[model samples]
Target chain A: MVWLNGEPRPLEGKTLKEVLEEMGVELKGVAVLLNEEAFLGLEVPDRPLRDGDVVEVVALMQGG
Target chain B: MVWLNGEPRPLEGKTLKEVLEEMGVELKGVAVLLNEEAFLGLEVPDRPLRDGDVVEVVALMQG
Candidate 1:
């Protein structure tokens, strides 16, 4: 699942949580969307994500 | 807002729609999270976004 930021990403058989884990990213203030649908934090555990899903993992950066 | 993607992005006083529009990306299949919370489609219009908001815009790509 390649995002507008760069090369197409490859997350096959990877759960939403697992994928982010591999990236070494923190979930504290981060959020993700699968195919444009917001994936809630509570849902991350059981949410069955698929490959090629343009998952946008975003975080709330400290700013005004 | 510099995302894991790279480069600190600058989206000042831009609505979620406007922000994504600037990127030339379609919003039909896209989903977003504001500060780690899901921003509902109905709520997008009035959602007053700010700088460094860490708005994660995601899309449902056809695999």
Candidate 2:
């Protein structure tokens, strides 16, 4: 169990990659946070996600 | 006023770009939604955000 943008959601794998893929999010121009800590791109695939973890996906859009 | 990832926050700009900046977020690999409506990268700077709007920023982290 995890809080995705404040909603309780189930996670399949222990890795962040699995979580994102399950969410159907495309990995381009995107950034992620685990428990409010920034997760680097290269580290997401192996980063472990635990129960009650808070995840926030931030997409870097254009302008400012 | 707006809800960012569920938390209510005051708005400083009418555009999405301004909102992100105000949040101190780095806009390098991110996507924005206005009231659940997706905002494309190229159009984010001009996208208008209103009161009581819900914005979700999904960052496309590399695997």
Candidate 3:
């Protein structure tokens, strides 16, 4: 029960890893954040999900 | 001239700063990427936008 990219999505009992993986997010090219804090890609697996949380999946592109 | 969160948006002469600022995105909680490369929040202001580029403006909230 979290908001993913401004859209409400159900994520009951799901780890951050499971959710992101389902979204097809590649770890190397992106960063993860929780509760306004940045988390390295490798650190996301153990991170838990909760209700009313907001998750932003940002895609990194080429630039300065 | 870029895709922002999967939607086509014009960014002909705007810097990443201008774009994010307009969207009200706070820098501390978010990460930015342009063309598959990560850019620190401090680096966004100087980052220029280009045509056909893809931009992802992500928001971070409580988990």
Candidate 4:
């Protein structure tokens, strides 16, 4: 399947969570803006990937 | 005095550095994407905020 995060690529049976986990990113402190929309951390890999999904992974820092 | 991160608001006399410090974020492990441009933790508050600056704060995860 074609998995995209800022760029388009093919991911072999890897969920977003799996990809992120492999990439060494903790989910709790991060936020994702996928295709100009905000998405929760846990919702990444499990959200399902189609042929075209522009994913922008962002981490949530502490702010007032 | 409009300061924008995800939304727009007014921040008074506060640099992005001062703001992040006040916000309690450790800069060493964070990454910021300002208006589609990626930035480092130390560069936030000091980067200067102009009117309609779309800032997206992101942290660098361990994974």
In order, the interface RMSDs are 9.9, 8.6, 9.6, 7.6
Q: Name the top DockQ candidate.
A: 2
lDDT of 3 by residue, B2-55 (tens): 888787887867988777655544565467778878766556757578898888
Better of 1 and 3 by TM-score: 3
Q: Per-candidate DockQ versus the true complex?
A: 0.04, 0.08, 0.05, 0.05
Q: Write the per-residue lDDT of candidate 2 for residues B1-63, one digit (tens) a residue.
A: 778766787763577777665444445556777774776534575746667888887765678
Where does model 1 sit among the CAPRI classes? incorrect
2 or 3, greater by DockQ: 2
Q: Candidate 1: list runs displaced more than 4 Å.
A: A1-6, A40-42, B1-63
How would you encode candidate 1's per-residue C-alpha lDDT over B10-29 as one tens digit per residue?
Answer: 66566776655444333444
Q: After superposition, how far is residue A28 of candidate 1 from its true place, in Å?
A: 1.4
lDDT of 1 at B43: 47
Better of 1 and 2 by lDDT: 2
TM-score of each: 0.41, 0.47, 0.47, 0.41
Weakest 10 consecutive residues of candidate 4 chain A by summed lDDT: A20-29
lDDT of 1 by residue, A1-64 (tens): 4441244666566677665554434455466666787755335655555555666766545467
Q: Give the alpha carbon lDDT tens digit for every residue of A1-64 in model 4.
A: 4544545567545567765554335566566665577767766547655566666666676558
CA lDDT for candidate 4:
0.59
How many angstroms is residue A47 displaced in model 2 relative to the true structure, after the best TM-score fit?
6.1
Lowest summed-lDDT stretch of 10 residues in model 2 chain A? A21-30
- For each of the candidates, what fraction of the native contacts does it recover? 0.00, 0.00, 0.00, 0.00
